[PDB]
Design a protein around this ligand. Structure first.
Ligand SMILES: CCCCCCCCCCCCCC(=O)SCCNC(=O)CCNC(=O)[C@H](O)C(C)(C)COP(=O)(O)OP(=O)(O)OC[C@H]1O[C@@H](n2cnc3c(N)ncnc32)[C@H](O)[C@@H]1OP(=O)(O)O
Ligand SMILES: Cc1cc(CN2C(=O)COc3cc(CCCCC4CCN(C)CC4)ccc32)no1
Length: 411
């Protein structure tokens, strides 16, 4: 059962979501006035704390908690080690609400014990295309389009309870207090992703990995020698040959994005994301925030020829602590972010992505099969991983969609 999730306004089973035909709210319509003004109760030995995610030392504290206690792969070989600069970037986009950053500490000694973060996002989340066609067949076009306008909602990420405090029903409390603070801002939906199955995803995608430094990955046990590489005299030399990349990008006029590219990159990205059922809508301020280059955090390259931006790609860095190997401290992973191609095939664009990432010392390039990411898997030699990313809404009925109809990248 789900003692917590059964009480929440989300579809409860796969069967329920097979049935949903229109996008819309699950819950009782409510007002800010209905929502408690005071934080949710918690044990006297704890307190709620709102870190200042633009203060270096508050960023450091959250950084430590995540470094030591956040997501691990299924065999606890790797643990995400999001950097402090990455955390300030992800948690402080334009018009972020400091209150949506919710921490728990031990009252006595201010020991940091748990965290959960909300940030705003304007998301297109109306009835997906395939369901609108059915709606129109049935004369229900109006019901189907009702919630088509981009909504100002909450994106939740970074939920983390300290390893000492697991299975004490703390996470429900964080979710409740997060829900309260968001409702008090008059926001009633949230979108979240997780690598675990909860009630109930609207989309689910596999993870894909493209080795950049195969000898290191094999050492740290990220990959391993496919027993078909045992056919060969020298498995390692063949593996390096298979994954070798150009040492310089191949598209003429590739360069890093600059501030004056903002409007053009906004246009081409928004034209592209508009073709997906679920996807974010970005102002210029959000385009500069989420895509302008930031050392060690986000890297974005544009194709410009005849000074017109016709193509761009972006990736962001999340290192992972290598928990089982002491020879290497870190796995240096690059994560495919947003992109758009109008002048060249997408595999040709993302090949440059791989070249840059390799060139900058990244060990592997990861992504989920959202967007048009499947369109370059084979030719660029990405392999499916163990993981799946599951997409969820809070308080929003949504029909099942393919991951290739999801245009929202989560950090
Ligand atoms: C309108 C505004 C709405 C805003 C809120 C929207 C909702 C956002 C929801 C959050 C989106 C987060 C997106 C990300 O950041 S996903 C990343 C999650 N973080 C990690 O995996 C880090 C490693 N793990 C931990 O720190 C803890 O294990 C966590 C905190 C994950 C669970 O803590 P713990 O292991 O000590 O368990 P408990 O005894 O306290 O609680 C047990 C209950 O918690 C349910 N549970 C377990 N894992 C998750 C999970 N990832 N999302 C939602 N619920 C989860 C579980 O099914 C059970 O409920 P029920 O089955 O009894 O019913
Ligand atoms: C093996 C392996 C490990 C990695 C990097 N990684 C970690 O270090 C920690 O465990 C992981 C687990 C997953 C799948 C689960 C991802 C769930 C979160 C959900 C929270 N946010 C929005 C980002 C992704 C992908 C990559 C890693 N990539 O391949």
């Amino acid at each position: 059962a789900h003692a917590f999730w059964s009480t929440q306004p989300v579809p409860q089973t796969e069967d329920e979501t097979e049935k949903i035909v229109f996008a819309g709210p699950m819950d009782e319509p409510k007002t800010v006035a209905d929502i408690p003004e005071e934080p949710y109760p918690i044990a006297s030995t704890f307190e709620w704390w709102t870190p200042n995610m633009e203060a270096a030392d508050d960023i450091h504290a959250i950084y430590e908690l995540l470094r030591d206690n956040y997501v691990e792969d299924d065999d606890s070989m790797f643990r995400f080690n999001y950097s402090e600069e990455f955390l300030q970037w992800a948690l402080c986009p334009p018009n972020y609400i400091p209150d949506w950053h919710v921490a728990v500490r031990r009252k006595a000694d201010k020991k940091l014990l748990a965290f959960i973060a909300g940030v705003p996002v304007t998301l297109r989340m109306g009835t997906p295309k395939y369901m609108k066609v059915k709606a129109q067949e049935k004369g229900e076009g109006e019901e189907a389009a009702k919630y088509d306008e981009p909504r100002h909602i909450c994106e939740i990420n970074f939920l983390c309870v300290h390893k000492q405090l697991r299975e004490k029903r703390l996470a429900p409390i964080l979710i409740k207090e997060a829900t309260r603070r968001v409702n008090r801002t008059n926001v009633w939906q949230a979108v979240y992703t997780a690598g675990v199955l909860l009630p109930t995803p609207y989309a689910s995608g596999q993870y894909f990995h493209r080795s950049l430094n195969p000898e290191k990955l094999v050492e740290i046990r990220f990959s391993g020698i496919p027993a078909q590489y045992q056919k060969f005299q020298n498995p390692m030399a063949m593996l390096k040959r298979n994954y070798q990349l150009p040492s310089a990008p191949k598209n003429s006029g590739l360069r890093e994005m600059k501030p004056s590219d903002v409007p053009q990159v906004r246009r081409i990205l928004m034209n592209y994301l508009d073709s997906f059922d679920v996807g974010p809508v970005f102002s210029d301020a959000e385009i500069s925030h989420y895509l302008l280059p930031r050392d060690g955090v986000v890297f974005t390259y544009v194709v410009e020829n005849d000074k017109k931006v016709t193509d761009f790609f972006s990736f962001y860095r999340i290192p992972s602590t290598v928990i089982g190997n002491s020879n290497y401290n870190l796995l240096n992973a690059a994560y495919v972010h947003y992109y758009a191609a109008t002048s060249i095939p997408l595999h040709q664009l993302i090949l440059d992505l791989l070249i840059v990432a390799h060139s900058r010392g990244f060990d592997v390039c990861n992504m989920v099969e959202i967007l048009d990411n499947r369109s370059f898997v084979e030719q660029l030699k990405f392999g499916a991983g163990d993981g799946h990313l599951r997409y969820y809404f809070y308080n929003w009925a949504y029909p099942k969609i393919k991951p290739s109809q999801v245009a929202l990248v989560m950090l």
